[PDB]
């Protein structure tokens, strides 16, 4: 059902600080090598007032290479697709809300992303753009209430040194009742691989990678 190829269209609606705005992508990537890249354009609130960094973990858990040890609850999703959902805890109390409702159309995957964040204080480094990128993660996946979990210690890395710190939890929700794996860990890198001068086009890059914890 999943293609070893499988193309990426997308639209992101919300705003940031009371700051709306609106990015549509195109994409391709390899679900079973866990890699993708997608384009990302402004269409509304351009130029954009906050790092673009906030916004790069909500623009699919299908793009995991996941061992065959693991049921894989993303691609069995489909063709029915799955949603999730997004907290994002800043350390300065900053917070950013996402939901994400991915479909799929012969190779193509489709997403309605909505993002929302608040409480920024304006000489913050989101605000001041002072993120230069995530540092590599590890996503602790698991089940709860018969739901798909998933947790991840996040850091931004910024100008003048220091890290910026975020807790990630994420819900995920398949469209149909799909085998749900055991705790497993997922293993993510996402890199801004390009960007014009106010990020109004951007080339983003995830390649991540499905595995148990390594303690025994």
Known sequence: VIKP???IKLRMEGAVNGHKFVIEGEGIGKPYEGTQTLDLTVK???PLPFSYDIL???FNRAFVKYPKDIPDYFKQAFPEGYSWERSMTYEDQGICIATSDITMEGDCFFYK?????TNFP???PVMQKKTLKWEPSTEKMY???GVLKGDVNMALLLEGGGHYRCDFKTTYKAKKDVRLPDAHEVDHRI????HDKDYNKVRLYEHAEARYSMLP
């Open 113 to 117: 992303i909505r993002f929302d964040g």
């Open 122 to 124: 304006p000489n913050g």
């Open 191 to 194: 890199e801004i691989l390009s």
């Open 5 to 7: 190829e499988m193309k």
């Open 143 to 145: 089940v709860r209430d």
């Open 56 to 58: 790069t973990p909500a």
């Open 44 to 46: 509304e609130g351009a």
